[PDB]
Amino acid sequence: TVDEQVSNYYDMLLKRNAGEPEFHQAVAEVLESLKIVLEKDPHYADYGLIQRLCEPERQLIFRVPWVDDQGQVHVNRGFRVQFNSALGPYKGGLRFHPSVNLGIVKFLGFEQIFKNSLTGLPIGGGKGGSDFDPKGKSDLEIMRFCQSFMTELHRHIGEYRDVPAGDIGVGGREIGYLFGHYRRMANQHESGVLTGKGLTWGGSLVRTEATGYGCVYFVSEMIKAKGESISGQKIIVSGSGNVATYAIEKAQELGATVIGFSDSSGWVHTPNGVDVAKLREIKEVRRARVSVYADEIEGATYHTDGSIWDLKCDIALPCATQNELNGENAKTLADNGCRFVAEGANMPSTPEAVEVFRERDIRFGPGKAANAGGVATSALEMQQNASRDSWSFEYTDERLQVIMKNIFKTCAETAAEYGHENDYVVGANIAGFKKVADAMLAQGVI
Amino acid sequence: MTVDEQVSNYYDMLLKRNAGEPEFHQAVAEVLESLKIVLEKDPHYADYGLIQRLCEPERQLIFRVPWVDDQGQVHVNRGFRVQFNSALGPYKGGLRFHPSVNLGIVKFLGFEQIFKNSLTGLPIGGGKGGSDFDPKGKSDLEIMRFCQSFMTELHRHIGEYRDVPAGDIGVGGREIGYLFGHYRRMANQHESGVLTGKGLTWGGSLVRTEATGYGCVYFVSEMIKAKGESISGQKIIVSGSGNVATYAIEKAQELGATVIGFSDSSGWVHTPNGVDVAKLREIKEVRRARVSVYADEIEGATYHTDGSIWDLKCDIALPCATQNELNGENAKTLADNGCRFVAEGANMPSTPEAVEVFRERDIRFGPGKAANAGGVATSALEMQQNASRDSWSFEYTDERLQVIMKNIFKTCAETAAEYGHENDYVVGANIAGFKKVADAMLAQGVI
Amino acid sequence: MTVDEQVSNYYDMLLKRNAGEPEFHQAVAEVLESLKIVLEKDPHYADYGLIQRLCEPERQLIFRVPWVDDQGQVHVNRGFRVQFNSALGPYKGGLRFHPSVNLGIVKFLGFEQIFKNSLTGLPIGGGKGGSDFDPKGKSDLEIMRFCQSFMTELHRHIGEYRDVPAGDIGVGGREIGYLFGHYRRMANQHESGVLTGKGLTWGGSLVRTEATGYGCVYFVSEMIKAKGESISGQKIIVSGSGNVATYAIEKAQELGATVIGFSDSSGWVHTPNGVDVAKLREIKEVRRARVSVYADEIEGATYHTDGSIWDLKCDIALPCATQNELNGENAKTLADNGCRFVAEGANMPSTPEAVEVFRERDIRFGPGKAANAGGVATSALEMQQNASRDSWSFEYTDERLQVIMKNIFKTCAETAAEYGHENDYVVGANIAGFKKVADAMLAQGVI
Amino acid sequence: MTVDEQVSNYYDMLLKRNAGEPEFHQAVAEVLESLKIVLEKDPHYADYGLIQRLCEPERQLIFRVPWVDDQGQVHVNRGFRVQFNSALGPYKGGLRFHPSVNLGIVKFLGFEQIFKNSLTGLPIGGGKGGSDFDPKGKSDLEIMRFCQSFMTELHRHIGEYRDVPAGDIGVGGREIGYLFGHYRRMANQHESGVLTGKGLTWGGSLVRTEATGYGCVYFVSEMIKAKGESISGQKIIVSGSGNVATYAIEKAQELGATVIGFSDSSGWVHTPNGVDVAKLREIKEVRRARVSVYADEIEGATYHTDGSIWDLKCDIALPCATQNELNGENAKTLADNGCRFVAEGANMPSTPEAVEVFRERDIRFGPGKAANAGGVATSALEMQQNASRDSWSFEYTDERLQVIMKNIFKTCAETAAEYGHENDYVVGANIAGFKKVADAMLAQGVI
Ligand SMILES: NC(=O)C1=CN([C@@H]2O[C@H](COP(=O)(O)OP(=O)(O)OC[C@H]3O[C@@H](n4cnc5c(N)ncnc54)[C@H](OP(=O)(O)O)[C@@H]3O)[C@@H](O)[C@H]2O)C=CC1
Ligand SMILES: NC(=O)C1=CN([C@@H]2O[C@H](COP(=O)(O)OP(=O)(O)OC[C@H]3O[C@@H](n4cnc5c(N)ncnc54)[C@H](OP(=O)(O)O)[C@@H]3O)[C@@H](O)[C@H]2O)C=CC1
Ligand SMILES: NC(=O)C1=CN([C@@H]2O[C@H](COP(=O)(O)OP(=O)(O)OC[C@H]3O[C@@H](n4cnc5c(N)ncnc54)[C@H](OP(=O)(O)O)[C@@H]3O)[C@@H](O)[C@H]2O)C=CC1
Ligand SMILES: NC(=O)C1=CN([C@@H]2O[C@H](COP(=O)(O)OP(=O)(O)OC[C@H]3O[C@@H](n4cnc5c(N)ncnc54)[C@H](OP(=O)(O)O)[C@@H]3O)[C@@H](O)[C@H]2O)C=CC1
Ligand SMILES: N=C(CCC(=O)O)C(=O)O
Ligand SMILES: N=C(CCC(=O)O)C(=O)O
Ligand SMILES: N=C(CCC(=O)O)C(=O)O
Ligand SMILES: [K+]
Ligand SMILES: [K+]
Ligand SMILES: [K+]
Ligand SMILES: [K+]
Ligand SMILES: [K+]
Ligand SMILES: [K+]
Numbered sequence A: 001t002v003d004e005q006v007s008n009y010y011d012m013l014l015k016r017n018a019g020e021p022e023f024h025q026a027v028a029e030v031l032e033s034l035k036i037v038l039e040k041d042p043h044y045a046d047y048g049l050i051q052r053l054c055e056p057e058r059q060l061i062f063r064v065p066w067v068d069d070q071g072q073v074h075v076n077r078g079f080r081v082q083f084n085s086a087l088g089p090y091k092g093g094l095r096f097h098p099s100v101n102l103g104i105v106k107f108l109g110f111e112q113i114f115k116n117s118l119t120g121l122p123i124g125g126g127k128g129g130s131d132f133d134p135k136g137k138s139d140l141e142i143m144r145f146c147q148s149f150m151t152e153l154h155r156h157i158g159e160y161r162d163v164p165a166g167d168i169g170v171g172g173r174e175i176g177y178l179f180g181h182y183r184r185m186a187n188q189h190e191s192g193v194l195t196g197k198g199l200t201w202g203g204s205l206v207r208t209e210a211t212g213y214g215c216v217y218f219v220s221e222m223i224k225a226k227g228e229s230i231s232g233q234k235i236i237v238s239g240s241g242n243v244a245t246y247a248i249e250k251a252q253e254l255g256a257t258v259i260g261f262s263d264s265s266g267w268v269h270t271p272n273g274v275d276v277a278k279l280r281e282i283k284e285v286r287r288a289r290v291s292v293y294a295d296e297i298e299g300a301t302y303h304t305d306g307s308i309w310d311l312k313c314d315i316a317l318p319c320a321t322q323n324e325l326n327g328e329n330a331k332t333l334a335d336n337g338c339r340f341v342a343e344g345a346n347m348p349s350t351p352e353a354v355e356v357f358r359e360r361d362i363r364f365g366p367g368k369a370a371n372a373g374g375v376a377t378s379a380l381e382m383q384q385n386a387s388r389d390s391w392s393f394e395y396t397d398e399r400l401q402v403i404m405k406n407i408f409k410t411c412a413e414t415a416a417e418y419g420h421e422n423d424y425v426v427g428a429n430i431a432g433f434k435k436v437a438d439a440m441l442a443q444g445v446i
Numbered sequence B, C, D: 001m002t003v004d005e006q007v008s009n010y011y012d013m014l015l016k017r018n019a020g021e022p023e024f025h026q027a028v029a030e031v032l033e034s035l036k037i038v039l040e041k042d043p044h045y046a047d048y049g050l051i052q053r054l055c056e057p058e059r060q061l062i063f064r065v066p067w068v069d070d071q072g073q074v075h076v077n078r079g080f081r082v083q084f085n086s087a088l089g090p091y092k093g094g095l096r097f098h099p100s101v102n103l104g105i106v107k108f109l110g111f112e113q114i115f116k117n118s119l120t121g122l123p124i125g126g127g128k129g130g131s132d133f134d135p136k137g138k139s140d141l142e143i144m145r146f147c148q149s150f151m152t153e154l155h156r157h158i159g160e161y162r163d164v165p166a167g168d169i170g171v172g173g174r175e176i177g178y179l180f181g182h183y184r185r186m187a188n189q190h191e192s193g194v195l196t197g198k199g200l201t202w203g204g205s206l207v208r209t210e211a212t213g214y215g216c217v218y219f220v221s222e223m224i225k226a227k228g229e230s231i232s233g234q235k236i237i238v239s240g241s242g243n244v245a246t247y248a249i250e251k252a253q254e255l256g257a258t259v260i261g262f263s264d265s266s267g268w269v270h271t272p273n274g275v276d277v278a279k280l281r282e283i284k285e286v287r288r289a290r291v292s293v294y295a296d297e298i299e300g301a302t303y304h305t306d307g308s309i310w311d312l313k314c315d316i317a318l319p320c321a322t323q324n325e326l327n328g329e330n331a332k333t334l335a336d337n338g339c340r341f342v343a344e345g346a347n348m349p350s351t352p353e354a355v356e357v358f359r360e361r362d363i364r365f366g367p368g369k370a371a372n373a374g375g376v377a378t379s380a381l382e383m384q385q386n387a388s389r390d391s392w393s394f395e396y397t398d399e400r401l402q403v404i405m406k407n408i409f410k411t412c413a414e415t416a417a418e419y420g421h422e423n424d425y426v427v428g429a430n431i432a433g434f435k436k437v438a439d440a441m442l443a444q445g446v447i
């Protein structure tokens, strides 16, 4: 039977991949959606397709030795998982955070395959990063770390090979140091090697805003599917980094009010809305804690207690990290009348959180659909670079809006095609999978 | 201790490291004078040894070029490629074959290339190269063999993303063909983006011939609008009658202005109702004759041998002939006659005294650095066409060139005002070319 | 804090970075115990984060290996290459195809290999690789397709100066042939130095087949002579029945000892009157059969699936199968029954409890990184022969191997004594191997 | 049409192409005087523009070397590699890190290197490189970071068959370690043959440390014996106190001579009872202190800041410091005081006036391209060891070195005499060095 075939393969996978719970978590949800497609179209398991799909094409782990400002040598671990290249070059971000390990990178890279497929743009899936902690490091220490990291990474990447970008801990600053050092290693100005670049050295307008903006563009599409208006809505946006910052900005441009945001230290309550300019100054100039925002803003309350999800909202947009919204937060959310969740972060909702949303009739936008705005805009940066062109903000934002609407459409149409109307998780996973699978079938056993 | 003191200290050290290169010294001194204004407002532009990095080429290649003449005699020349700065894109800049070429000349021109290319707003870095090979008196086969020997070494250092050379004195379409053909032979690939100035049927761009002349006129049109005026119905002088002047005349008249004079080394022509571009080209390209031959045949146009083209009463003067062709006396004549606008199509045609006269007399001045950048802009457009495997129409390309020139003007105007020098386009051009490179260098780290 | 504390704290951190890899933790733990001793005397050895760099692989590659079986069914296995340390030379170490393989096991092997390779005195860094592919039951064509898929990825990461693999469990001459053929196809060149354990007519070395087992016996003979005994007349257990075990048995019996038992993973054979090497070779190499078949065919040999081979009373135990095959209970049984010498042909066959028993019970114990190093030493001789396009005689190469094993023993004994742990070859091996690598690492900077 | 006129006309052209490089002109002029002697007997040596090709480097690289000091300040130095001639082997020659370094100095050294390398009889072309980086006062980490930045560019231009650098002034074992480590990191392979002067545990050669100084003494011994004298009991001046000077002192005293003075750039020390090698090594290698500190801590040794080391009465002078350190005035003094032999450990230490005085006063003179060749010869032996993956004994290597220096002497004396310039080892060295290179260039065609 199909259900048992897939369950028995998942079991095999758990054995080969012992101790990688985030990867198991990512895989599990996808294969659950894959069961549906195999019942209708069995050829999708032909030629060991699922066995190939779930094993990364290549994984790199490497030493990153570097020297701090006191002349002390440090060693961190670097990673690049090149998961699938059926649709185009490996594509996906780099995360510098002390939590990072191979299992986490594999989870992100596996998800990235289906996210990138969903954009409709020609990009395969990958991810990388390091257990390096950028917090408390000088710009020179960050620079030397990025240079050491790229000293190994450059041989494994390239405009058609693998195109990284930022993620947690890797912003414009780091992409700058990584790109410069890549050019030094390769002796060429290969703009297409990375995305997230600066506007004067091959970057794209809107890329900075893309993930957070598209998240909101997606959530507004789920909201308007219920005959509702995002204007006038109360929104929680967890996190205070690249994705959260611009999610808040688009949200409040659209008539909504963001009532809370957070970092890993705690969360701040803003019942009358966020000052974007203030927050950007605290986070980007001062690289400070959100409590400083509370300290300086009238009526902003810093919290170290409870959770940001204790706030009454109509919409929640988790934009920080994996497993930041759990089963209990999900209940608290629905009890206070939350109506839609859409993920800016990668895999922020736990499995039981997702279960609650279903039980409680909360419309749920999965990250691989909702946050695809980032990588889609990265693919647009790649397109601009490929043609040595530079697009306006308006034109690029318009394309991003079109892609997000296309992703919504695909999720809706496929979910309904397989008898799971309005289940966007089912729609996203099946639609992302089928395009990859068809390409893999066409390109043979490789 | 002070800003002046630290910069002067550095310039002194540059002199010592770069002994015997006075042109490069002077080019660097001119840049350092621009940084002073910048540092005064924002010191961070000298952080992380930015100036010390900027003034040292990323890489310099010098190499033997052995070749054999038609009589079987072996000759040895020296080849050069200075890859100065790649912060904004691949190294970009021409190749010159002339006995005067040496490393200091190449470094000088390569350094200046960085900022001119930056100022276009397009993703190109800066470099320069060539050889002391003298093409004069050489046969086509001798020049081919030289180009082939030259590129046997050069090919390994260049590439669509690495370094994209072009022509200059001694390196025209003929040489670009021989260099490109041999590059493909060495590399075993048909990499169109390795060079610009290529033939139309093998990766070249329309508007290349017209670019520098057209761009000068686009630039001056923006200067004119900035004063509440329009270029249509104005009277314009265009000096010279070569590549730049021909196409400067063509565009100005397209935009509805009337051109009243042109010239060669020998003399100058008054054409009070307009130039016959078709006639001029025939005279100069087909017949390779003097401009006197022109005046005979047009009813209303008169030739002149005495005085100067700059005696003519005009609204706009576009010197498009040669360095130092417009002196302080000329500048005075123009201003007295009511000329309100000068923009340079040629290389430094206005003498330093002429430049001060425009300032004194309130004539708006478009320096060549900005106004004659159409040629380099179109080189970037060739790269863009090659990158997308497309060959654009004349009209589309010319439209893109106009947008680029408009943006160069905007950048000059905005930057000049930013630094307390409203409407001083030389200040604007100098500062804007530097700051874009500097910002990109800061972002990309110590490399 | 105390060296003990510092090293223990570092180890704790390593357990966290490398969760779920007990064999890697085991290998690291014993080396770090010896390193405490060297650090107590010469603390400079921790300078510049040397230990932190040493215990973190330079590079690790994991990759998909898709292949098609004889029924046309697609299978997917995982491939690995850990390139641990290159201070002393190219990464060097074998490839293991066994269903137990995972990244933790490959890391343990690669880590051990650094020090083993250092101890040979030859210029070789350390690495290891393999796959969870199970070669048992596969046809030659299936093995071939697997090796070709494996090398389709591996080739870009290896090379005569980059990384030089070889066999290990499940990878013998058959697999090396298919791996080498396909490397040449991928690289388009006949790069003999890319692999060792090659066939004699395409760049292999005489003695390499025999080397690990011969070397193990040469090493244990030195241990025995150091105690004033001699190997002739002794009873020896040799576990396993593969490449290492076969030639340990051959050399042991040449030197006048009698091998009283051997095994595979299914069971063990008691051979009270010694082993017929020719019969064992026919069974294992031709028939690829179980050791039970030897017992069936040989008068006086008995097959067992009960108990352990380590239940046999012996003078010398040579575990030659795999990691953790000789445990604390086995060690006590061996000791109680009169075993006086243990030398490891396998990598890490003795569990930590077993090693403690040997220490406590005064059993002389030759760690794998010393006793089994004859294989990789002879691989380096294969590399030397290839580099010089020479082919040495069996007698010359075997003489070199004898001198190396004697040198390794002398290094372990002297280093152990130097550091106040006389006759502790674990301490001697780890310290001597570490110092050479650490010196080379200090000289070569932070890389 | 006369040989002098032919060669003189070329020199004039060399002068204009290489303006501002007096040391390079100095080195070329003296070689060209020898080529006139060659051409008078064998005019074919100028065929196919051979001399024009010989005197122009095949390739020259100049590059930015940005690095960060311990206080986090960015510095920029200039790096060079001149790849002069590769007719006989890969480019070969050292790296000089000193504030005096510029292209003309690198060119002089690279030019000399061609003929020196030729004379060794071993398969090595000629090159040189360096930087104006001053290693004096820098921390180990600063030196490491500089080397790593230097090699980040240099790696793409070097390699076992391409270009093999080594040390020279300011570049010792410490630097070579950091350069080699970083090269392996850039190339991702353990390519031992990329550099010489490597450490003993990572592909170095025994004798290389001692080789230049030892070889200089071996050479001067041959000069001495040729005059019917012997080295034992003689009084020797050795200028400098670095790698070359140190081992010239060691070998000279091992052979029974007394070294009565050495120096650094600050002053000289008088040692009438001979030098304590171990002490000098301590002061210079560990403490990196001044020679004056030797005089402080050693009874009988006196430091001088007046006069020159060259006014010590000696039998033998070995200049072992730098170019142009022994002038016409020093040469006269030496001779007046009874000096009979001079042999150059340094490159081009004797000025042209000094060399005329030696001739005029019957002082036998060994030019550096002969006398100092032991260093590069032993580098070639390191390359041979690496190529064959062998490591030779000190005794074997030193005996090869002895044979090479005797052969170089014989070649110089025999060639000098063949051309009618008996005992002129400058003519002998230049002609013998040149002919081997030229014959190989003729065979390899116009490239
Ligand atoms: N940037 C992009 O283009 C895209 C990003 N994403 C995903 O969106 C999420 C955020 O990315 P991005 O905004 O770029 O990263 P940033 O580093 O710019 O911001 C991360 C934010 O989340 C917080 N955070 C990080 N780790 C944790 C944690 N372990 N527990 C609680 N909070 C944490 C950070 O706070 P603190 O300072 O206290 O650590 C910070 O406020 C990630 O899941 C990322 O994978 C998805 C698509 C695109
Ligand atoms: N074309 C381009 O894209 C580029 C142009 N430039 C600069 O632009 C200027 C012109 O370039 P280009 O048009 O290509 O050169 P051309 O050779 O095509 O044309 C030059 C014209 O200037 C005339 N001329 C020279 N000197 C004088 C003078 N003293 N008084 C009046 N006329 C004179 C020449 O006449 P005559 O036949 O009698 O000599 C000829 O008519 C130069 O300063 C050049 O360096 C620089 C780079 C590129
Ligand atoms: N070959 C070399 O040059 C060197 C090998 N070594 C080490 O020597 C040992 C043997 O290697 P080698 O002889 O080359 O390998 P082979 O594959 O030729 O032989 C392995 C033998 O050990 C038995 N064995 C393997 N795995 C297990 C297991 N998990 N449990 C019980 N028995 C097992 C096998 O029996 P079965 O068929 O039932 O699996 C077989 O008899 C390994 O530790 C290896 O790393 C060390 C240095 C060099
Ligand atoms: N090393 C080699 O293998 C070979 C080197 N050579 C040549 O040998 C010479 C020395 O090289 P090497 O010993 O390796 O370099 P080192 O840097 O090890 O030592 C150079 C020595 O010369 C001293 N010195 C520099 N200038 C003077 C001066 N003007 N008067 C007196 N002493 C001075 C330096 O003193 P201070 O510290 O004050 O600068 C230092 O004691 C150079 O000409 C080199 O090109 C030739 C062949 C081989
Ligand atoms: N960090 C990203 C964006 C990746 C990208 O732009 O390649 C993500 O999709 O998680
Ligand atoms: N399997 C080996 C030897 C492999 C080799 O010869 O490189 C080992 O030392 O474990
Ligand atoms: N510094 C040296 C030795 C160079 C080398 O060993 O390649 C010289 O010959 O000048
Ligand atoms: K690459
Ligand atoms: K393209
Ligand atoms: K190229
Ligand atoms: K390879
Ligand atoms: K015995
Ligand atoms: K039996």
Ligand SMILES: [K+]
Residues within 6 Å of the ligand: D155, D156, D157, D158, D159, D187
């Ligand atoms: K190289």
Ligand SMILES: [K+]
Residues within 6 Å of the ligand: D229, D230, D231, D232, D233, D234
């Ligand atoms: K004597």
